[PDB]
Design a binder for this molecule. Structure first.
Ligand SMILES: [Zn+2]
Lengths: 19, 76, 232, 76
């Protein structure tokens, strides 16, 4: 069975956040 | 025996396991069925996160027990 | 308001601040040992029920109108519960106040499971939402339909790379909307009125994928959708 | 004297401490052992956040007490 990562999609993010 | 693995969405997976299986083995069977890498998987039973080296017998996980699967999510 | 831009935010008298809340034994998910279970870089992750989001001075606010992107600080209150808990009552929760601010909010649960899950990330913890407070519930409900459509789209594109736009609409039309959304059926316009958000969710989901699994953005379904709806 | 520090990641830390040590001193000890900068640490005991500038004896914290460590990540 093929690899399938568990993920989140970003609904909103503050511009203060760098990564 | 059969156990169930339930995700936070309510999705339920059925596994075939033995009491001597380790949590590590169960994560591999979850990978086999669902494709989720074991390093993403946190398994919880009776309110506590489970340790990879311990067995279902160690935790008294029994026929048709339900484990909770919580994922270390990929995100950007 | 210089933060906001009408209901107001309240909390039980026994609510505590975020670090004090997170150490309550009701949220202890480990039998601690010498090695640890998680990285120090991983935030603790809990459920949060009876929640409400407000600006730096009192008014209930939405989270999807751009306030977060303008770096306005939205705080939130609610009852934190163990991550596995499916009971949205206050029972067994730990009341928290002025949590956050919200650095990021997100969708997860592209399982094929019933629920769409919404999460908040703070500098202390991550919270998967259960039920809004009665007074925040109108604001939260406004967002629920586009969240759920995004879930269906991502899940259909995951399991039908070789599918076509019309097949995606058939999946949307036959998906029974979950309770509390108070709709009989999704329709093709349910997708089109929210097409910019939905497409942004698909591409964000794609971006989070490992550089070795098939994308879902570059599909027949999406390019028809981008064209048919005017998505930038 | 010995105290313990329990994290939110399932780790128990043992420290060597004096009653006259300030909360900042305790955080520096946690930095020495775990590598966590003190400004990212919050220490909670019996529901109460322990403040910089007070000592363990100010809080009447005795040998074999267990403190609870909450981390604030830098950035996001
Ligand atoms: Zn306001």
């Amino acid at each position: 069975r093929t690899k399938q990562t568990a993920r989140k999609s970003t609904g909103g993010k503050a511009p203060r956040c760098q990564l | 025996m059969q156990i169930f693995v339930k995700t936070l969405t309510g999705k339920t997976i059925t596994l075939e396991v033995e009491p001597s299986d380790t949590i590590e083995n169960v994560k591999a069977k979850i990978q086999d069925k669902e494709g989720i890498p074991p390093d993403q998987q946190r398994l919880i039973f009776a309110g506590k996160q489970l340790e990879d080296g311990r067995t279902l017998s160690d935790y008294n996980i029994q026929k048709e027990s339900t484990l909770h699967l919580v994922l270390r999510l990929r995100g950007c | 308001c210089i933060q906001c831009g009408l209901k107001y935010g309240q909390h039980p008298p026994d609510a505590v601040d975020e670090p004090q809340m997170l150490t309550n034994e009701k949220l202890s998910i480990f039998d601690a040992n010498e090695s640890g279970f998680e990285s120090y870089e991983a935030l603790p992750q809990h459920k949060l029920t009876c929640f409400s989001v407000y600006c730096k001075h009192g008014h209930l606010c939405p989270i999807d109108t751009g306030l977060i992107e303008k770096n306005i600080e939205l705080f939130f209150s609610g009852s934190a519960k163990p991550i596995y808990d499916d009971d949205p009552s206050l029972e067994g929760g730990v009341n928290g106040k002025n949590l956050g601010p919200i650095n990021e909010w997100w969708i997860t649960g592209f399982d094929g499971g019933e629920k769409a899950l919404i999460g908040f990330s703070t500098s202390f913890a991550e919270y998967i939402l259960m039920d809004p407070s009665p007074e925040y519930a109108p604001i939260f409900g406004l967002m629920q339909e586009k969240i759920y459509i995004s879930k269906i789209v991502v899940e259909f594109l995951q399991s039908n790379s070789d599918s076509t736009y019309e097949d995606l609409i058939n999946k949307i039309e036959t998906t029974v909307p979950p309770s509390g959304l108070n709709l009989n059926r999704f329709t093709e316009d349910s997708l089109l009125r929210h097409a910019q958000f939905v497409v942004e969710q698909v591409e964000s989901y794609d971006e989070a994928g490992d550089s070795d699994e098939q994308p879902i953005f570059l599909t027949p379904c999406m390019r028809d959708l981008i064209k048919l709806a005017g998505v930038t």
